[PDB]
Write a protein that binds this ligand. Structure first.
Ligand code: MN
Ligand code: MN
Lengths: 198, 198
């Protein structure tokens, strides 16, 4: 069965960029619910033995009778599993992907500007992503717990823009949350996701 | 043409069921944004001089270049316009629709249970509605700022289940918010919307 992964740092470690109370609820409540409901959906079926990456990549072929529960809770589980590892108290803006960003956009600042614009323009619940699409870097957003993996695009950076991810600290000010995010991006994890990209 | 309606009560009037900070941001920031963006979408079109009820009811007829902008911001304006008028510090569980609820569900409690299940189960951003469909009462939910008007079903009660509507006070506990909602329902406005229902 699927398990709630521990955070790789304390609940306070991303302060003041993300508040401890949000990290605790977002992990212990929101992610845990996705794991509970994912397990209920796949329990005693062949899906129970697969990686969450494989299930979401192959979501469009999951049996119709559970496909929605797997979309929501499988997506939820994968997206938050990625997110916790893509955050760090020791962010360093360097490495393979930062170098590739600088060459494609001209500066990290120009990339951050486009990412912030795409992330702010996601209407309702969802995620902003940096993806590898056919060997090119592309910024896309997805609704609810959808993941670009499902459409053959490998996510290497994600930002949760569900209001639960930012409302306690930022309320309506999603752009201020996006600004604070840059301070805690784990570019080592971004590089790892980019290198593993098929 | 379109204007941010003033609340029928002070920001503090719905305490302790809905916190004053939420009432203030939700109206002054979230609703105001929908009005700004709506005005920008319809500036120099026939829509300028239509009611928002007519625009949303006939969404499928809006020019396609601006239809999504009108779905989002037109929806946002109508939904929040209804919501403010459907809340009150003087909630009385009686009248035309309460009687019709008791007759159809057997009890207000039975009706609340269906509304609570539908409202809690709506995944991502959206609204839970009591509507008139072919003269009968139905509970439905919509995503984002979609409104049942567009589907020819008349909304007479709505609950905002976007996380911005409840996160500051209730965080993940959407059911506790839904439960607190009953204390501030304006059943007089519910009756008025029902009586108008065409
Ligand atoms: Mn989340
Ligand atoms: Mn709202």
């Amino acid at each position: 069965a699927f398990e709630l992964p521990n955070l790789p740092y304390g609940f306070r470690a991303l302060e003041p960029h993300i508040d401890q109370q949000t990290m605790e609820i977002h992990h212990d409540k929101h992610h845990n619910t996705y794991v509970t409901k994912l397990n209920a959906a796949v329990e005693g079926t062949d899906l129970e033995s697969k990686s969450i990456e494989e299930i979401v990549a192959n979501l469009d072929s999951v049996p119709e009778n559970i496909q929605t529960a797997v979309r929501f809770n499988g997506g939820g589980h994968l997206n938050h599993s990625l997110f916790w590892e893509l955050l760090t108290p020791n962010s360093e803006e360097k490495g393979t992907v930062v170098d590739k960003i600088k060459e494609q956009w001209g500066s990290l600042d120009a990339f951050k500007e486009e990412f912030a614009n795409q992330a702010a323009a996601r209407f309702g619940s969802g995620w902003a992503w940096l993806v590898v699409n056919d060997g090119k870097l592309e910024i896309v957003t997805t609704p609810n717990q959808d993941n670009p993996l499902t459409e053959g695009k490998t996510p290497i950076l994600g930002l949760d823009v569900w209001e639960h991810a930012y409302y306690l600290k930022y309320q309506n000010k999603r752009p201020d949350y996006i600004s604070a995010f840059w301070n805690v991006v784990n570019w080592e994890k971004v590089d790892e996701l980019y290198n593993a990209a098929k």
